[PDB]
Design a protein around this ligand. Structure first.
Ligand SMILES: CCOc1cc(CC(=O)N[C@@H](CC(C)C)c2ccccc2N2CCCCC2)ccc1C(=O)O
Ligand SMILES: Nc1ncnc2c1ncn2[C@@H]1O[C@H](COP(=O)(O)OP(=O)(O)OP(=O)(O)O)[C@@H](O)[C@H]1O
Ligand SMILES: Nc1ncnc2c1ncn2[C@@H]1O[C@H](COP(=O)(O)OP(=O)(O)O)[C@@H](O)[C@H]1O
Ligand SMILES: [Mg+2]
Ligand SMILES: [Mg+2]
Length: 1166
């Protein structure tokens, strides 16, 4: 008995029942979901797939044959289950015919009801078993493919010829999408054979039941596959265009958020809002065609069946002597409902098959890519794959336990020599003799997305003693302390960015820490200060490494410390000039030794569905559209039910002109209302998306700066990228499907109840059962989706990590550890996805048994209760129909809940408070040339960044003469920038008042105040587009004024050199210019602003010495007339000022002419 009970448990997915039921007390964390059975682990699947692929390559090799030889048996079994399911499912129409007409007990009309019940139960059990088996094999294939491509990545070659700039993109695409497309094709694989057979058998059954008149309907419906494929192609094209425009919009939005403070200061927030709204309008224009084609798809899907039914029954009435009997009519109707789904989804199956062919071609093209005392080399020619000898005639020697520095000119080949030693380059000749893992500090530093502690340890055992030794020797303890968490701090692309010097120091620390006898350091001092380099060499290279008697080779152009080098390698143009000790080199090569000296001298609580947010989304478009949607859908479903009831009435009898006319009118109304409802739903979706995004962008850009400082930019960009995409594309189709399924189920229930009143007694318990299933599945699946996504993200992150810095991994010999990590991550992701699919199967099976119970009850009650044969057929038809949609209603309800979560996020963002833009003072009281005078005063200023915080500035009072140069200085965190922000009003004023030109700055429309004031920040920021755009996006000044400003800033020559002059394009972040160039561009912007007041915060900061001097000259000359308030670090510049206000942790402190306070914290700083 036990094996049979276990088979039943595996058939109804009872093993997921406990998990789903426990999804209430505690969310489903990874502990609840056990580990994969050894059969489904990624290691075994990878072994099988690799074995098959190698067998293929034994005799060009095809991934298709390897995949078949690996996972053909599971899919063959799934196909067998699918065929049995189709055969049993065609017991619906046949049994409907038998029951509607009514030793051989099969015609008793009661045994047929229980036969229908059993056949339906077996059909759905087999169908769900087939789905689960195909999904299991698909996930196994995804695991195997990920492991195989990861091994190839580990075995890739780093030559620029093969691993191009887009190689990382290709690998990431393979991991993310291509493998997913192949997995989905595996999921849908049984359909490619199950659906054509089902369609052919359905058409044959229609022909047998309904005479030759079934051919017309069969052809009309079969025309539904080409149409669906055509509109699917159109949808793909429209979605590609929409994604392009959305990417442009998101680039603009990200640029806006990154540097919001500067935009708000410069009153350019609304200009960039208009710029983003232009791209949003284009995206909505594209989405209009996308939604039009989606509406056409839904209209075809819901209308072609009705047109086919109309044609079939008109032809049968006007071309067959016998009248339309009830049994045959409703059997044909059920067969049409059965065949509509295969014909609609065959297009999707074929589309995925084509995409999988493309994906496999891409994967194969990738897999066919280029790959591959202490140390002595002899007669070694190394090439990067081109064929030319990049390095020739190498006779290098690296004595054990000694320092061997390799020096040469740039482009010499030193890094190439190290990589060749590591085996990353093809060895045309020669050999490399080892007398094992070697620590490698790549010339380009590489850091994992893990924490600093893990990155520096890099998998080795933690030793606080050695950790501190390396950190102090690396001089990284201060930079570590400055981190928000110190150790255990996220870094890398996703983590907190670090300066290049910090990254290189981290990499050098990693190389030093690990226990290896050979250490390869390549230009560790490229991004380090002279003092930092000296400390690193004296403490780490000389002492720390010599303590363990390790072997170190250092590649650096800094000839300094060449005396400390036990061995020296002189290389030039890919060839060793001389190798040996400094004294030996000088004795043998006097010229070289003297040459180096020349360079030396040079210097769960909540689970309720969000109904409030759902209603808010529904009403967002407008009450008229919502009313039209509801009315159109109700009228369409009433017309469809009327069509079926009119069919029943027509078949009741047993001339036909009246019935045919009425039926044709009803079918025409049905198709017209299908079109109307599709258009209305898409219209509502479009209006909702437009309104929501418009309001969200406006509110966010108009919000306070404190919000931007608090909320990470990641969250806001996610609200603009993921939530916006959901609202645009996923919500409308999901709502359409949910409403269609809900109304179909309700109409079926109502029609069954009317035809068979007794059905309500058995409907009462099934309602409770369905409610419980709905609740439990909704919560469980909502949790499992989050689990799956959170598990998926680290997998792509790890693939990106391994793709980069491959040389570091293969130099540490830590490839095995990374491979094991990948196997663990992919196993976790696969188990998460598999259990999500298992929850789906659980729900589907329970709802299938519920539908079987509904069908049994409806059949028995209708047979018992006398009724028109047509009415009995109608009841049975709807009892079969409700079964197919009971599952989809709940699944779409869960999806709608998930998406209303995102809409709730957007709504919450809409509720953010807005800055007090409105100014108390009358606009008419603000003269146009208000800031011309330059008069400025302060009255015990007290500014707090946010309420309930200690005042950054407290009781500051000062007077500034018109057209006067004022200076500001102080130690870090002294509140210097607080005064500037108060000037601009961005930072709220806790107490006091500031008067500019005899007006209260606080009591003014903040836009006017911001526009007519000039501010320069520490790091210059440039916005994408033309130079003219950056000079004045408002376009409220003559073009020649821009040339005058450029000439004043001394940038006229640079602009002229670039093509197009003022129209020369500019890249985000100033990548098209040097830092000094960006700073002088900002200075030119301030000049063209003609504010007459200049505020500078670290203008010289991050500025070249020549850049600093030219900026100082420009400030002295151009802005002489206008007031200048300088907040700088170097006191040198402020010396030329006439009034300096130094502050210390909230105190006006010193205020007098530079000489006045020199009669003395200022003197100490100077
Ligand atoms: C992650 C998807 O894993 C599945 C995988 C399957 C296997 C499968 O050949 N389905 C047929 C549907 C059957 C009823 C015709 C199909 C065909 C084309 C497109 C999508 C689909 N299906 C995929 C979802 C959209 C409609 C049904 C079933 C169900 C699932 C599932 O979600 O649980
Ligand atoms: N990964 C690579 N793939 C292909 N060719 C490379 C690669 N790295 C360097 N080369 C080429 O090999 C030759 C020497 O490269 P190498 O890395 O030694 O440059 P370098 O400027 O001497 O380095 P360093 O920064 O250490 O001074 C040059 O032709 C360089 O273009
Ligand atoms: N966005 C902010 N929100 C709240 N407080 C801040 C913010 N920025 C700086 N502060 C606080 O204000 C004080 C003054 O810093 P400040 O003088 O502006 O720095 P800097 O010298 O770099 O200009 C600091 O001690 C800091 O903690
Ligand atoms: Mg190099
Ligand atoms: Mg500052």
């Amino acid at each position: 008995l036990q094996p049979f009970v276990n088979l039943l448990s595996k058939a109804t997915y009872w093993w997921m029942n406990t998990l789903i039921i426990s999804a209430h007390r505690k969310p489903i964390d990874l502990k609840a979901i056990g580990k994969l059975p050894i059969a489904m682990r990624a290691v075994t699947n990878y072994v099988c797939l690799k074995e098959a692929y190698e067998e293929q390559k034994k005799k060009t090799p095809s991934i298709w044959l390897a995949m078949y030889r690996a996972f053909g048996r599971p899919i063959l079994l799934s196909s067998t289950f699918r065929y049995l399911a189709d055969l049993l499912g065609f017991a619906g129409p046949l049994c409907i015919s038998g029951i509607v007409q009514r030793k051989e007990f099969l015609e008793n009309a009661h045994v047929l009801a229980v036969l229908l019940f059993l056949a339906l139960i077996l059909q759905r059990t087999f169908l769900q078993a087939s789905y689960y088996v195909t999904i299991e094999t698909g996930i196994n294939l995804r695991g195997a493919l990920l492991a195989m491509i990861y091994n190839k990545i580990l075995r890739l070659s780093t030559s620029n010829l093969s691993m191009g700039e887009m190689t990382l993109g290709q690998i990431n695409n393979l991991v993310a999408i291509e493998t997913n497309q192949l997995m989905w094709f595996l999921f849908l694989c049984p359909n490619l054979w199950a659906m054509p057979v089902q369609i052919i058998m359905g058409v044959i059954l229609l022909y047998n039941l309904l005479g030759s008149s079934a051919l017309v309907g069969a052809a009309v419906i079969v025309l539904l596959a080409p149409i669906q494929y055509f509109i699917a192609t159109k949808l793909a094209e429209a979605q590609k265009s929409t994604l392009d425009y959305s990417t442009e919009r998101l680039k603009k939005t990200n640029e806006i958020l990154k540097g919001i403070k500067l935009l708000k200061l410069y009153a350019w927030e609304h200009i960039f809002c208009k710029s983003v709204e232009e791209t949003r309008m284009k995206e909505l224009s594209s989405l209009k065609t996308f939604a039009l084609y989606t509406s056409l798809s839904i209209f075809m899907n819901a209308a072609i069946p009705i047109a086919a039914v109309l044609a079939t029954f008109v032809t049968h009435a006007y071309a067959s002597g016998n009248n339309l009997k009830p049994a045959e009519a409703f059997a044909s109707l059920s067969l049409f409902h059965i065949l509509v789904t295969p014909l609609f989804l065959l297009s999707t199956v074929v589309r995925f098959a084509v995409k999988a062919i493309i994906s496999v071609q891409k994967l194969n093209e990738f897999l066919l890519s280029d790959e591959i005392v202490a140390i002595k080399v002899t007669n070694g020619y190394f090439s990067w794959g081109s064929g030319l000898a990049t390095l020739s005639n190498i006779d290098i020697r690296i004595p054990t336990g000694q320092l061997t520095m390799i020096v040469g000119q740039v482009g010499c080949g030193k890094s190439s020599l190290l990589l060749a030693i590591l085996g990353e380059m093809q060895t045309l000749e020669g050999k490399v003799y080892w007398n094992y893992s070697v620590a490698y500090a790549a010339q380009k530093p590489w850091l994992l997305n893990a924490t600093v502690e893990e990155n520096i340890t890099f998998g080795s055992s933690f030793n606080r003693q050695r950790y501190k030794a390396v950190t102090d020797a690396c001089s990284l303890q201060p930079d570590i302390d400055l981190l928000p968490f110190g150790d255990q701090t996220e870094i890398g692309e996703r983590g907190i960015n670090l300066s290049g010097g910090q990254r290189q120091r981290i990499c050098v620390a990693r190389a030093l820490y690990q226990n290896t006898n050979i250490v390869f350091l390549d230009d560790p001092f490229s991004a380090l200060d002279i003092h930092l380099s000296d400390h690193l060499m004296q403490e780490g290279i000389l002492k720390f490494l010599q303590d363990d008697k390790r072997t170190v080779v250092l590649v650096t152009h800094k000839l300094q410390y060449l005396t400390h080098a036990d061995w020296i390698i002189a290389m030039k143009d890919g060839s060793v000039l001389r190798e040996g000790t400094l004294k030996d080199i000088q004795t043998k090569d006097v010229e070289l030794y003297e040459h180096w000296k020349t360079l030396m001298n040079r210097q769960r609580l909540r689970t309720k569905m969000p109904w409030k947010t759902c209603w808010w989304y529904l009403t967002s478009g407008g009450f008229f559209l919502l009313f039209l949607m509801i009315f159109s859908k109700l009228l369409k479903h009433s017309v469809i039910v009327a069509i079926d009831y009119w069919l029943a009435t027509w078949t009741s009898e047993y001339d036909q002109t009246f019935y045919v006319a009425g039926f044709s009118i009803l079918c025409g109304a049905g198709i017209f209302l299908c079109l109307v409802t599709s258009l209305t739903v898409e219209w509502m979706g479009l209006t909702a998306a437009k309104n929501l995004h418009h309001n969200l962008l406006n509110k966010i850009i108009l919000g306070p700066i404190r919000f931007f400082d608090t909320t990470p930019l990641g969250l806001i960009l996610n609200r603009f990228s993921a939530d916006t995409n959901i609202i645009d594309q996923h919500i409308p189709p999901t709502l359409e499907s949910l409403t269609r399924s809900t109304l179909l189920c309700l109409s079926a229930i109502g029609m069954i109840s009317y035809a068979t009143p007794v059905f309500l007694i058995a409907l009462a318990p099934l309602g409770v059962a369905f409610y419980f299933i709905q609740k439990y599945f909704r919560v469980a699946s909502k949790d499992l989706q989050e689990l799956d996504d959170s598990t998926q993200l680290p997998l792509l992150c790890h693939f990106s990590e391994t793709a980069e810095g491959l040389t570091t991994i293969r130099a540490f010999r830590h490839e095995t550890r990374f491979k094991q990590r990948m196997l663990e991550l992919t196993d976790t992701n696969n188990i998460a996805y598999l259990f999500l699919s298992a929850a789906n199967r659980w729900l589907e099976v329970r709802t299938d048994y519920l539908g079987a119970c509904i069908v049994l009850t409806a059949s028995i009650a209708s047979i018992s209760g006398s009724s028109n044969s047509g009415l009995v057929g109608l009841g049975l038809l709807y009892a079969l129909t409700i079964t197919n949609y009971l599952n989809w209603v709940v699944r779409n309800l869960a999806d709608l809940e998930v998406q209303m979560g995102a809409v709730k996020k957007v709504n919450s963002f809409l509720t953010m408070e807005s800055e007090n833009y409105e100014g108390t003072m009358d606009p008419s009281q603000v003269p146009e040339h208000w800031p011309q005078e330059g008069e400025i005063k302060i009255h015990d200023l007290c500014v707090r960044y946010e309420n309930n915080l200690k005042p950054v500035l407290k009781h500051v009072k000062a007077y500034i003469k018109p057209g006067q140069k004022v200076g500001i200085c102080g130690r870090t965190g002294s509140g210097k920038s607080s005064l500037s922000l108060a000037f601009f009003r961005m930072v709220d004023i806790f107490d006091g008042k500031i008067v500019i030109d005899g007006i209260d700055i606080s009591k003014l429309p903040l836009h006017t105040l911001r526009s007519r004031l000039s501010i320069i920040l520490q790091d210059p920021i440039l916005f994408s587009g033309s130079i003219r755009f950056n000079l004045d996006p408002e376009c409220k000044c003559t073009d020649d004024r821009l040339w005058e400003a450029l000439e004043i800033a001394q940038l006229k020559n640079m602009v002229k050199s670039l093509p197009g002059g003022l129209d020369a394009t500019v890249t985000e972040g100033g990548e098209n210019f040097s830092v000094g160039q960006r700073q002088l561009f900002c200075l030119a912007r301030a000049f063209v602003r003609k504010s007459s007041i200049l505020i500078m915060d670290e203008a010289t900061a991050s500025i070249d010495m020549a850049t600093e001097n030219i900026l100082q000259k420009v400030v002295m000359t151009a802005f002489a007339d206008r007031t200048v308030v300088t907040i700088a670090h170097r006191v040198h510049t402020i010396l030329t000022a006439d009034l300096v206000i130094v502050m210390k942790r909230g105190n006006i402190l010193e205020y007098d002419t530079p000489e006045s306070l020199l009669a003395g914290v200022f003197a100490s700083f100077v």
